[PDB]
Amino acid sequence: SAVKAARYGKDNVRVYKVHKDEKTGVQTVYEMTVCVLLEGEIETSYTKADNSVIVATDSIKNTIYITAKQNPVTPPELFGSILGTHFIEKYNHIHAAHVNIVCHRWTRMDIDGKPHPHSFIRDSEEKRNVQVDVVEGKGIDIKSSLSGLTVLKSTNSQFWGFLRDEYTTLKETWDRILSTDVDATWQWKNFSGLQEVRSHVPKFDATWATAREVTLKTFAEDNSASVQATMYKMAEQILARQQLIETVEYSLPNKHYFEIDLSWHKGLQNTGKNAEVFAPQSDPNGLIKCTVGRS
Amino acid sequence: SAVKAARYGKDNVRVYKVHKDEKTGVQTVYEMTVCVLLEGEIETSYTKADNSVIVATDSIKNTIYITAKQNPVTPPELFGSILGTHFIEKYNHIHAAHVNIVCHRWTRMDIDGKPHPHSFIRDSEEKRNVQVDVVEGKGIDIKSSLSGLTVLKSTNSQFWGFLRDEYTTLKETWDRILSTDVDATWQWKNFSGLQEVRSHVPKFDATWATAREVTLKTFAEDNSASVQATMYKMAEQILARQQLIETVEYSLPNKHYFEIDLSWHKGLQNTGKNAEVFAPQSDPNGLIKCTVGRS
Amino acid sequence: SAVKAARYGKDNVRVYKVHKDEKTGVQTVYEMTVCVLLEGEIETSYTKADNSVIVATDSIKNTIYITAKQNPVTPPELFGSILGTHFIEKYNHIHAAHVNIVCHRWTRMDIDGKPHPHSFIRDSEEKRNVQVDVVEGKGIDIKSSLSGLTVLKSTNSQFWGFLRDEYTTLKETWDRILSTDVDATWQWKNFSGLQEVRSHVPKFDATWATAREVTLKTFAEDNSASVQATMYKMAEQILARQQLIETVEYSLPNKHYFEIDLSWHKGLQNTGKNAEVFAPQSDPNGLIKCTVGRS
Amino acid sequence: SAVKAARYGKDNVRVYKVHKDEKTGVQTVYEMTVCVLLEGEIETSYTKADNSVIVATDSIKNTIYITAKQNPVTPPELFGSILGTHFIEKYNHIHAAHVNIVCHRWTRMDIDGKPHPHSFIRDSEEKRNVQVDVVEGKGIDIKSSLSGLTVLKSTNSQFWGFLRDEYTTLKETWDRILSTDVDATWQWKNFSGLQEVRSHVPKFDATWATAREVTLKTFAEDNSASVQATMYKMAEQILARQQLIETVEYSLPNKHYFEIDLSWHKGLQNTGKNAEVFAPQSDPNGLIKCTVGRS
Ligand SMILES: O=c1[nH]c(=O)c2nn[nH]c2[nH]1
Ligand SMILES: O=c1[nH]c(=O)c2nn[nH]c2[nH]1
Ligand SMILES: O=c1[nH]c(=O)c2nn[nH]c2[nH]1
Ligand SMILES: O=c1[nH]c(=O)c2nn[nH]c2[nH]1
Ligand code: NA
Ligand code: NA
Ligand code: NA
Ligand code: NA
Numbered sequence A, B, C, D: 001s002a003v004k005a006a007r008y009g010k011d012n013v014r015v016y017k018v019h020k021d022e023k024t025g026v027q028t029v030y031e032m033t034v035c036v037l038l039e040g041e042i043e044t045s046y047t048k049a050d051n052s053v054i055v056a057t058d059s060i061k062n063t064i065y066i067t068a069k070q071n072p073v074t075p076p077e078l079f080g081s082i083l084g085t086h087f088i089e090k091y092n093h094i095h096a097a098h099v100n101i102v103c104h105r106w107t108r109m110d111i112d113g114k115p116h117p118h119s120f121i122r123d124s125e126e127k128r129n130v131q132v133d134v135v136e137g138k139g140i141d142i143k144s145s146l147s148g149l150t151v152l153k154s155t156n157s158q159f160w161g162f163l164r165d166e167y168t169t170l171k172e173t174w175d176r177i178l179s180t181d182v183d184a185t186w187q188w189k190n191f192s193g194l195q196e197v198r199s200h201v202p203k204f205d206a207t208w209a210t211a212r213e214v215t216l217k218t219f220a221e222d223n224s225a226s227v228q229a230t231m232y233k234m235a236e237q238i239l240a241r242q243q244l245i246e247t248v249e250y251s252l253p254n255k256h257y258f259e260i261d262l263s264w265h266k267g268l269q270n271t272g273k274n275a276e277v278f279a280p281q282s283d284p285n286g287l288i289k290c291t292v293g294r295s
Helices: A043-047 A057-070 A076-090 A194-199 A201-221 A227-241 B043-047 B057-070 B076-090 B194-199 B201-221 B227-241 C043-047 C057-070 C076-090 C194-199 C201-221 C227-241 D043-047 D057-070 D076-090 D194-199 D201-221 D227-241
Strands: A002-020 A027-040 A094-104 A107-111 A114-121 A127-135 A139-153 A178-188 A245-254 A257-259 A277-280 A285-293 B002-020 B027-040 B094-104 B107-111 B114-121 B127-135 B139-153 B178-188 B245-254 B257-259 B277-280 B285-293 C002-020 C027-040 C094-104 C107-111 C114-121 C127-135 C139-153 C178-188 C245-254 C257-259 C277-280 C285-293 D002-020 D027-040 D094-104 D107-111 D114-121 D127-135 D139-153 D178-188 D245-254 D257-259 D277-280 D285-293
Touching: A002 A043, A002 A057, A002 A094, A002 D227, A002 D245, A027 A057, A027 A076, A027 A114, A027 D285, A043 D227, A057 A076, A057 B277, A057 D285, A076 A094, A076 A127, A076 A139, A076 A194, A076 A201, A107 B201, A114 B201, A139 A194, A139 A201, A178 A201, A178 A227, A194 A201, A201 A227, A201 B107, A201 B114, A227 A245, A227 A285, A227 D002, A227 D043, A245 D002, A277 B057, A285 D027, A285 D057, B002 B043, B002 B057, B002 B094, B002 C227, B002 C245, B027 B057, B027 B076, B027 B114, B027 C285, B043 C227, B057 B076, B057 C285, B076 B094, B076 B127, B076 B139, B076 B194, B076 B201, B139 B194, B139 B201, B178 B201, B178 B227, B194 B201, B201 B227, B227 B245, B227 B285, B227 C002, B227 C043, B245 C002, B285 C027, B285 C057, C002 C043, C002 C057, C002 C094, C027 C057, C027 C076, C027 C114, C057 C076, C057 D277, C076 C094, C076 C127, C076 C139, C076 C194, C076 C201, C107 D201, C114 D201, C139 C194, C139 C201, C178 C201, C178 C227, C194 C201, C201 C227, C201 D107, C201 D114, C227 C245, C227 C285, C277 D057, D002 D043, D002 D057, D002 D094, D027 D057, D027 D076, D027 D114, D057 D076, D076 D094, D076 D127, D076 D139, D076 D194, D076 D201, D139 D194, D139 D201, D178 D201, D178 D227, D194 D201, D201 D227, D227 D245, D227 D285
Parallel strands: none
Antiparallel strands: A002 A027, A002 B277, A002 D285, A027 A094, A094 A127, A107 A114, A114 B139, A127 A139, A139 A178, A139 B114, A178 A245, A245 A285, A257 A277, A277 B002, A285 D002, B002 B027, B002 C285, B027 B094, B094 B127, B107 B114, B127 B139, B139 B178, B178 B245, B245 B285, B257 B277, B285 C002, C002 C027, C002 D277, C027 C094, C094 C127, C107 C114, C114 D139, C127 C139, C139 C178, C139 D114, C178 C245, C245 C285, C257 C277, C277 D002, D002 D027, D027 D094, D094 D127, D107 D114, D127 D139, D139 D178, D178 D245, D245 D285, D257 D277
């Protein structure tokens, strides 16, 4: 036998950073969870017990805090690229660094209609993430994403005209609830290295904001023919608005809300046009995916 | 042996309700998870296999949907009281109904600066809850609460002057991070029955809003001497603003963020006045509780 | 306003301890999560910012590790009593210590039919817990429990003869699946103090084992008329087998498995006597509780 | 823009099946969670709102229950292959079916030293999984796995001789705790279709058992030089014992247990040879991966 693939490092490294503006007194916090896995000429640690090749995972954890101390942690696309570049430049035998970052929301509180200088609220478990793969000789590949964006519309969703055969019981509908947790990922064209990533820094936050805005607007305004049709409209718009994106991927659960027939109880009417009370279903759930790219 | 206490019913009943304004076209959704447990003359189901005394938990689930169909589901204090009153009035041998409700956030989306008619976002896992105990001959006891309100301030928190003995290693500090998940409960004076609960309906949402506002303001503005001292200031204000509240209880974890000494690496300075990067600690955590009532 | 109740301390303190037998070379590990909350004359930390009264929660965490270093951690009833007694004896103004312990399973591995000296497996998320309240002048109150014991029987469960009215749709049944997660708690008679707790040490593990054995046997052998009737039989036996127990409490969810009617598809028969494939329901669930004590 | 990739179906379909032996009276239960995603000529549902191409996810859910009704659900490799083959044969425009199955433990209870006929216990959250990709014209690809196997050894683990530079603080050690959650996957050589999968049925359970046995034995007996070195020994053995496996992949967290220096308290000795009480760390954690194949 032989090692066909190997990667190792530190996962779940929680990091917080505060920036303090001495002029204004305003403080801004950033909190993230970071994973860094390395690849390179490390097979012998597995096959020969040769630890000489191992940059200890504890050392990777130290490096993450040090890098956060010496560099900006925002946008995460930049931080991730700096962190990945560090490992492949620092260590001759390490040839790829894979950096995943999950950013947690700390939104400045408004107290009495004015932004507070140093207090924050976690407004939702929605995350902004990046995956950065820094590979020696092959540049920097970045996938950015939002996830945990949970939405619901109570009408203007339809689902009819689907295949019907001896396995089908679902009724066609022209008015249903649609609810999902949005996972959207946009993949950047490959960057030659850190200098190029730095040159595009303003695009990272702008594109994240555009992706979120397009998602929310389209979800709210599309009179939806299906999850499929609505997510395609979202991805289409993101690609149109940022030329440095190569592909947009969406993964959307269909979180079902079922009508409850109550007519068995005093002829109570609670279905179709009369449906007011529904039973949210924890499982199963539809799962709909698509990756959209350029013609 | 003898049955000393017994209660039974249905937990985790997810309920969604939509209200549709035909004039304006505006829709509003409510989603909750409900638990109803009953007590009464039911010992024989346990001791004699006498199921004749059991209102089936499946029937309790049906009743919850029916009651939501025929009544307002908001404020939850009212819905809970209606649901509990139903069981003790309907069934001669059932003498107490215990109703817990967790309300989930569905906040109307703003699209292009205007409130959307029928699309919503889950902005945070914060909940509004009620516990309603409806006991025959003893009225209606209601505890209202907010929970899962996660906040952080990056400065204006101190902790010094605590007991020091041979078990103490913690250093005194005059500037730290304070972060918590707020659980706050206010207990209403006992109500004689449903008519009285109905008569106070406007106070339920107002008091919930006041509790939340007081929590956020005090947390943000108090130059905090301890979690203890800050939570007391919160509870004091709520009691001052609503005379129908008997007690306010707070339970606050202290979610620690630890300085990371980096001076071992090139004399890098990251502690005290120089602390920028911190390690959020998943566990352990301080846990601080208090119940405040009237002089 | 006034402080009506207050308690504070450290939650989620993970502790592992290893015992090494130098003769045999055999090692045994214990892992627990501990919470200690204190009460006493501490109101002024809340009302006056008087930290002088606060034994820091960080110091409580240190004490837990120190106590585990100097004492046995098993049975947890003893460890908890030692830890609680420490705080009320050490500190004049602290008058109650509330200690909760959750013990995690590390079961010695059998390798080639023989018990391995120092390797262990987590065989299930089942826990053994204790709550110990050590109150100055009032002795030591101990509640012991098992939780997370998840079981299922595929037949020999019935449910018929329940109340039927205009809220009832559930059909009577003489053969169903019964599945639950067992939470069982036994409450010890009050102990005068640590010496008495020490004097009963052998009873703690024996009673835990008896409670578990009785639970499993009764669940498996009772042709069950209801969850109510089966849990009562369990509690009855535990009380009969240990005279130092005052009460036994059970809390059992009814985790429903629903028949799936498939007759719409080629007249396929999958209900009643023909039911083979079922849909486990994540929610809602029955919840059945009882506390049994002595005549 | 254009659809570059798309797949959709039903996730989180919980399925239970009971087999009843009429001769012996013995019952055996199986419980699983199933996901089926389809691919084929379905782009127009995304781009043109053409639902005509969509086999409804609700219909996929029906098919899963029907297939479980008419076929064995064990071994899951077979069930998955039957389920995937169904969709690509039944539907002309569907060309790939991706089936994931998670099997949940229901272990027959022993009551009084004898196996009970119809009662079961969930002994651990360990799972057995399969991923089956059934692709028209390309046969059946099966990856089998175990996950959630949580183990710990209290000694006979070492970690020394790793790279030391200006980022390193970790001390070398010749005796530590090693604890992990095992995720192991073995990939079968491609099968031509269902007939070939059927022909190898006895190998599926045998190989699963071998993988588990090898994992436990090696973990317990290896005097481990690193996680890397130990996992390689595991994968090497599995490949040696089953020629139909092409690759074995392991993903192992290093769940750290930290020494606690207590010497600040009365010179108490709790490090190195004296270490008895440790602090299990929830995060961060090492993460070590490798894929081993044939020379
Ligand atoms: O087994 C280990 N492998 C590693 O790569 C490592 N890094 N720190 N500790 C470690 N332990
Ligand atoms: O065992 C049961 N007890 C109950 O109270 C009940 N209600 N529905 N099904 C039930 N099963
Ligand atoms: O606010 C605090 N209260 C306490 O009781 C405590 N103990 N350690 N740090 C602390 N912080
Ligand atoms: O939007 C939907 N897409 C689907 O593929 C589907 N199948 N059932 N309901 C559905 N809804
Ligand atoms: Na390199
Ligand atoms: Na009554
Ligand atoms: Na005392
Ligand atoms: Na096909």
